[PDB]
């Protein structure tokens, strides 16, 4: 008698013990009120959401939702062990375009990136990965840089984080520490598996709905070609059966690669940083962050105004400050292009002040 | 107090009620032994398995496993969207190659193919669809024919089926009726969501592991261009696990089986008289007679491999010394042709004496 009850109790004990070590709570059920609060919070403009869709690859971008891949058609994995064949032998192992203000987050199963002979176990506070990842902006593209770990490069240790369940929304929250160039980062977790949106019918009960990626196609192409740019981590979610757990490796954009800015462009234009009050001549994370922040201070100044255009970049907008006399050029796609101080006593500066043509 | 307990009880009531209408049982938990029993049944040679991976597209083939796609990267969704538009106006609306004996099963969400503004409701015993699909063999390809329904082609009604839980394995079973040309068809259902195989570690509990598709890339390409329809709808739990989703499932035409295709049987039916078939009309019934007669030849104990057909490199010829018939099988296993040897003719005498057909 009760063989089924015994098996269920045994499953429940094993699940509770695994979840405890992994920092995992089973998804809740959602009242109407909860689901509304959860949907409000995930639809904020700067929200980054992880879905607990098991065994999935995800790419999230602020303002445009989450792209999900699951199944064998998630052979995207193999660019992630081709790389892992390649560390046998240059710290940048591989750059992968994902497609053509703005933050981004890429995540996939951590176990497929684990070290030689390694099984990642719940309870660990860090995991040594032979390859770490970083999202960057490379010439219009969102790209993933795969970096060989070791010593002379970037450490192998990746921190394991635990999410906090918000009892008001039924969502989870992971928080990343502040770094040079960026405040603490909140990442939302939708604990309900959601490979796509359920149709809003009587066949489903209320759940939060993660905004789904729309717009440009996500497609991985290998592109021809420091540790402060790394905000990557591992967290645990329930497995597909829902009774065990799986580790997920998560990678965020470099603080300096944000759509409006890229480290590449800041470096290219650092020659102008003296016009924004920066004396440093060395180019490093610290001074490029100074330059990025100086451009943001110029654009945020209440007396900075849109004034004219930069002929060479069709549809660019120029933002002028009448006190510092600085201009900053923004391309039509929103990318920072360049900036410098206007000389009002020179021909070209006089033409700009008079006509707006920079 | 107990606000969470009340919400959970209400969720459980709603789930049981929806599951009841849909014929759905929640997945079980598995002892080690149940998992081994389930894995043994799914590895039987002719097994066709559906996975209850929610909101997924799947392609299953005997002996090669299940291919799964879920997420946005289910873009072939729009294949079925495009035809649902093309239906405003030819019965055949599209033919989709899936890539280059052997049976096959293709499944996706049934709401994708319902009418616009149509919601499929649990409890229905059939569903009227504006398209139905058929799996075929077209020129080495496994392909999907999407057919407009209506008076002018094929009916719209698709049966809704319920799966039976096997308490010994923890798997479900769906059965399709026998038809002209095929016996009853057993379809296994792995009720545990499984977009891919869990790595066998201490982080997972025992569950049935469905064999996964290896081999040829599964890619969808449009191709230039009835008792062949064994399609149905069944329900599985949704991604949250607390509601249900309808799945539309299509099997291969009984005459399209890798070894045979309706197209090749039609092409070679001129030889059916050598296999004892007097009918001159070509239809499902007589093409099935021909298919069955070729199978009777290949199954005959006296039939032996003998020589080759050089015109098709690597082919094998199967000869029966009582009927004097030959059947030619291509190296990929496709039936090519067959006919009766005339031993008093030059080429028949050459074949008997040298194996050169």
From Swiss-Prot, chain B:
Signal peptide per UniProt: none
A GO term for molecular function: RNA nuclease activity
Domain of life the protein comes from: Bacteria
Cellular component, GO annotation: extrachromosomal circular DNA
Biological processes per GO annotation: defense response to bacterium; killing of cells of another organism
UniProt keyword annotation of Cell membrane present: no
Swiss-Prot/TrEMBL keywords: Antibiotic, Antimicrobial, Bacteriocin, Plasmid, TonB box
Similarity field: Belongs to the cloacin colicin family.
Miscellaneous field: This colicin requires TonB for its uptake.
Function: Colicins are polypeptide toxins produced by and active against E.coli and closely related bacteria. Colicin D inhibits protein synthesis.
Name of the protein this chain belongs to: Colicin-D
Parent-protein residues present: 313 to 697 of 697
């Amino acid at each position: 008698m009760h063989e089924e009850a015994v098996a269920r109790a045994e499953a429940e004990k094993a699940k509770a013990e695994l979840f405890s070590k992994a920092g995992v709570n089973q998804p809740p059920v959602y009242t109407q009120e909860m689901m509304e609060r959860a949907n409000s919070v995930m639809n904020e403009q700067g929200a980054l959401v992880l879905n607990n869709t098991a065994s999935s690859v995800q790419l999230a971008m602020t303002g445009t939702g989450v792209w999900t891949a699951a199944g064998d058609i998630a052979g995207n994995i193999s660019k992630f062990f081709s790389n892992a064949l390649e560390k046998v032998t240059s710290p940048l192992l591989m750059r992968i375009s994902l497609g053509a203000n703005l933050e981004a987050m890429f995540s996939l199963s951590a176990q497929m990136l684990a070290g030689q002979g390694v099984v990642i176990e719940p309870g660990a506070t860090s995991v040594n990965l032979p390859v770490r990842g970083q999202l960057i902006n490379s010439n219009g593209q969102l790209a993933l840089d795969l970096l060989k770990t070791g010593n002379e490069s970037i450490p192998a240790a990746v921190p394991v984080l635990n999410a906090v369940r918000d009892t008001a929304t039924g969502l989870d929250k992971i928080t990343l520490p502040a770094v040079v160039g960026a405040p603490s980062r909140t990442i939302l977790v939708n604990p309900v598996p959601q490979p796509s949106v359920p149709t809003d019918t009587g066949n489903h009960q209320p759940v939060p709905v993660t905004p789904v990626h729309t717009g440009t196609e996500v497609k991985s192409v290998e592109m021809p070609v420091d540790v402060g740019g790394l905000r990557d981590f591992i967290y645990w979610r329930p497995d597909a059966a829902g009774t065990g757990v799986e580790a997920v490796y998560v990678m965020l954009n470099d603080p300096l690669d944000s759509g409006r800015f890229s480290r590449k462009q800041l470096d290219k234009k650092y020659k102008h940083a003296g016009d924004f009050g920066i004396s440093d001549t060395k180019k490093n994370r610290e001074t490029l962050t100074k330059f990025r922040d100086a451009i943001e201070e110029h654009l945020s100044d209440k007396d900075t105004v849109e004034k004219g255009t930069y002929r060479r970049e069709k549809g660019s907008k120029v933002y002028f400050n009448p006190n510092t006399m600085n201009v900053v050029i923004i391309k039509s796609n929103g990318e920072f292009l360049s900036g410098w101080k206007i000389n009002p006593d020179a021909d070209n500066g006089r033409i700009y002040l008079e006509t707006g043509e920079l």
